[PDB]
Structures are given as structure tokens and as C-alpha cells.
């Protein structure tokens, strides 16, 4: 782990990968009106989750490849 | 059969990045819980989110050594 309270930011020119970065943030904003009872914030916070788990699941592939440090 | 297959950890060269994909998972069975009005489930939804863009840019450190897309 690494809690980056001085952070870079991020800045990884990648945006297939970004995507990702994107997708946990566009669920993260929107899990005060799912939990305000909004079903339609809900459907697309789930969506977002199934958006991600590809995501990832995809990058993995040449992840594996990189791994790098 | 299912659009969603499970690959645990085949060769071991994606594996901090494997967690992140588990991460995704374990936002999604917050979401009910969080949409019924549970603020503990609905804070660890938010934790999941944050614990989930931190792997990614710790990954986008790395990332932005790779340029695909």
C-alpha cells in the first residue's frame, strides 16, 4: 500500500487505462444519490463496476507483460 | 456460460493490479446495501472507491512508462 497524501497527481498518459482512473471517480461522486435513494444513480453506479471489471480485466493482459517499477 | 471469466492469477507478473480487480467486485455488493440507506455499507463503498483509485494510479506510475492507448 501507499497512502500518497503527496501525490503526483497521477499523469499516466494512458487512456484506455484512464478510463478506469475515471470510472472508480464517476461511481465515487455518485454513491450520495444512490444512497439518497435515487435507483437510476444506483443502476449506472452498478454499471460502473461492471465497466471497471473489464477494464481491468483487459488490461491485465499486458499488465502482466509491463509490471514494471 | 457467462460474458464474465475469473482468471486468479495465472502467471504471477499482475498481481497488486489483480487485487484492484477483486476491489471492483467488492464495490458492487456495497451498492445494495448503500442504495437501502445503510451508511456503514455506503462508507465502505466510498473506502472501496478510494482504496480502488489509488491502485490505479499507483499502476499509472508504471503506465505512463507504457504508451498503447
Given amino acids: 500500500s501507499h497512502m500518497a ?3 503526483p497527481g497521477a499523469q ?5 487505462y ?7 471517480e464517476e461511481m465515487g461522486k ?3 444519490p444512490t444512497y439518497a435513494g435515487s435507483k437510476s ?4 453506479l452498478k454499471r460502473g463496476i461492471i465497466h471497471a ?3 481491468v480485466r483487459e488490461c491485465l ?3 502482466e507483460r509491463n509490471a514494471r517499477t
Fill in 12 to 16: 499516466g498518459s494512458q487512456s484506455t
Fill in 18 to 24: 484512464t478510463d478506469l482512473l475515471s470510472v472508480i
Fill in 5 to 7: 497524501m503527496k501525490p
Fill in 53 to 55: 471489471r473489464a477494464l
Fill in 30 to 32: 455518485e454513491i450520495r
Fill in 41 to 44: 444513480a444506483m443502476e449506472r
Fill in 61 to 63: 493482459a499486458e499488465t
